[PDB]
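Summary: Need help interpreting a holo structure output

Steps to reproduce:
1. Submit the protein chain below together with the SMILES for 74L.
2. Request a joint structure prediction with the ligand placed.
3. Inspect the structure token block that comes back.

Expected: a single structure record containing both the chain and the bound molecule.
Actual: see attached output.

Input attached:
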Amino acid sequence: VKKLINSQISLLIGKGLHEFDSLRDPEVNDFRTKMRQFCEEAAAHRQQLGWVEWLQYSFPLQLEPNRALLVNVKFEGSEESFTFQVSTKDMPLALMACALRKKATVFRQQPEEYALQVNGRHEYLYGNYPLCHFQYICSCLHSGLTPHLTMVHSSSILAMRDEQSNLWSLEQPFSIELIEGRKVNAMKLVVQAGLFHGNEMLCKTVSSSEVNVCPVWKQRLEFDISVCDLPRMARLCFALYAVVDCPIAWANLMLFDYKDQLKTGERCLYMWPSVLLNPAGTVRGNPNTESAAALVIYLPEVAPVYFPALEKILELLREILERELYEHEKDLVWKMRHEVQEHFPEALARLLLVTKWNKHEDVAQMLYLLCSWPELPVLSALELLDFSFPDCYVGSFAIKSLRKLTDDELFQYLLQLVQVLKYESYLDCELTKFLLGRALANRKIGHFLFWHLRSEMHVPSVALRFGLIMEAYCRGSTHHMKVLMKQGEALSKLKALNDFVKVSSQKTTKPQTKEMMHMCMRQETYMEALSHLQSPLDPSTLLEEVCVEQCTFMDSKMKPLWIMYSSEEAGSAGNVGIIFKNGDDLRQDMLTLQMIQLMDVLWKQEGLDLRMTPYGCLPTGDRTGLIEVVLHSDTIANIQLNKSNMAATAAFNKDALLNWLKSKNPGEALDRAIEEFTLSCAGYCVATYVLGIGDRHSDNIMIRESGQLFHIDFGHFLGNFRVPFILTYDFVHVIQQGKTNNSEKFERFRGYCERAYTILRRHGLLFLHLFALMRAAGLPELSCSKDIQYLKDSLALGKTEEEALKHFRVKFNEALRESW
Ligand SMILES: CN(C)S(=O)(=O)n1cc(-c2nc(-c3nc(C4(c5ccccc5)CC4)n(C)n3)cnc2N)cn1
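--- attached output ---
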């Protein structure tokens, strides 16, 4: 029975569970036993949750960050629907009451026993919120479409739930013995070593003797640090390089084990290929024992030595600087450490960075303060997750403060909280426990954590950790694992179909490839596999029947697939599409869209909706991911082609954009589209300036028929070809209602840019903490300090709001002066 569940996890996580046993590692084995138990306890509490608490799990409320409307409501066991005239200020309960009252008159004879499902979607409408607070209601309000909802009784929700049940004495200096190696390079081999506590050295780097390219050393490597002065999270970093300078390989390893004991004696280090000394890199060796270079080293015995328990640890001009600092300034903060705890709690990061981690006496005093430190705000806790703060006690304190994250906030920073797992030193961590816990408490987080892990199973350095986490997750939800398997089955078929599409395009005409895509899709295995699955881009979006005749592929290099769906129940909300792309890395594209989505959220909170189109984009595997189709939209380029026998017949190229709008928004409807275009253009002007998105042209900027402008292809960001502000006459013409001179409309638009820019600037540090946590991903255009600096400069965070708004107008006018 459980053998199949074991076999299913294996196929789903892309790694056989036998591989975890083969290693014969007590860290892997104890992670698996503990996590499985923690995950089963989380699945248990979930099986005894009240029917509303289950809705908050399976279907978490999609709520937005007066005027009456028509709402079509039906029940389960019938096709009979009723169309009401409810208000946007109405709670769902009142609508639930009307549905029950109108059911009573039809059937000739309580709303607290119901939930309003969104037709053909895993989304529901419940809670003490007026209808206009629900994202589905607002999407129906702007598009003028009618909300189709189903009355789902408590027992029918409980049916779902039931059918888804599962020490100070060692004063000697720290030393090692560098024995021999087994590598490849064409010169002499020097092995530089070093001791690290995060980004910083605990003592000066000590090198090896230049031994011939042919390698044996047997050398003694002593460090400028005491054995009792090694912090718990001490990292020993190595670097193999050839010289007559050229790097070869790198390896790191913790001086303490997962059981807190100091490591002894012989250790073989399967090194990772190099591009100086890399302290950020993984403390687990290269899994390719066949082609990897090795480093045998000795950890000399000093006897069993365990790091002291917290009980033994606990037993042992100021304001003007608190807004990169000199040694006298550092000494001040450490002297004033108690006054920091008491009156400046948010300064903890600056106090943690000044403490001497190379002295056990210092660390303990700091830890005594930390154990009595008040909870920091979410923003302050997000800063503490960086590699800059490696201490376990610090790491735990950050999670302790992060527990007040709303499931909404957690979903906005999950990509960063997953990347941060790469910085980890051991498999068993409070971050994993947290991520897993929240994943098992909320299925949307459960879904997205999985895909963020699964999309990296091909990267050897993180394959064990991630594979292990996904396995632990799968223990806490047998049902969801089965649902995630259907997603993997669709994606498996999609890659095979794409592979054919790629070959056929190199051999025949497009209508010929398109018809055989269809033939291949119409097969039993493809028809079943690609149908009735929760979208990997949004688990609430149900990709029901695959609309094969409406499926094509794109002419761009990697021949992306256009997969259109339809649902009877959902009707028009069921008419959804997904773009499968295979060959490019969708990580930056996703991060950029997420950063845009956040900007929209920060703006929407301050009552400003700049009509942004933050379409889904999710990497699912090796250079494989999905893109959300923005239906009823086309590229500026295609609209500018100006085809004959159309309604968009333009005399001048400038008119093409506005003529297009005029045909898609007839009569009075056009006035709306121009405000849509102005608001979205303003938003994307700021977004792309702040983020530094370059290589913009008509082929990667799109328009919705609604008027809404948006951007695609974010392969380049942070000015990586200092990019200027962007302004095109084709857009200014549209903003100015199609008139040569209309400054009333243009100066209102100049306001939209300024306001959006100032709101973002107020959360500059949020973008700074999120990007600094992202560095863990290994994104080539987000690899160092120079990259974070682009954001610091585009957001002018080292200047006041007045000095920044003037400096912005300067960039805005120079973008307007370049506009023809
Ligand atoms: C740069 N890329 C190719 S991409 O990076 O793959 N990418 C596409 C998107 C994307 N596109 C569209 C869209 N595109 C087309 C068009 C079309 C469709 C089908 C066959 C041939 C042409 C180009 C007319 N329409 C009509 N819609 C919608 N929502 C998206 N989210 C985002 N990123």
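--- end attachment ---

Reviewer comment: Residues 310-482 form a domain with the Serine Threonine Protein Phosphatase 5, Tetratricopeptide repeat fold (CATH 1.25.40.70). Residues 552, 554, 556, 560, 562, 579, 581, 615, 627-630, 633-635, 638, 700, 712-713 surround 74L (CB under 6 Å).
Status: needs-info
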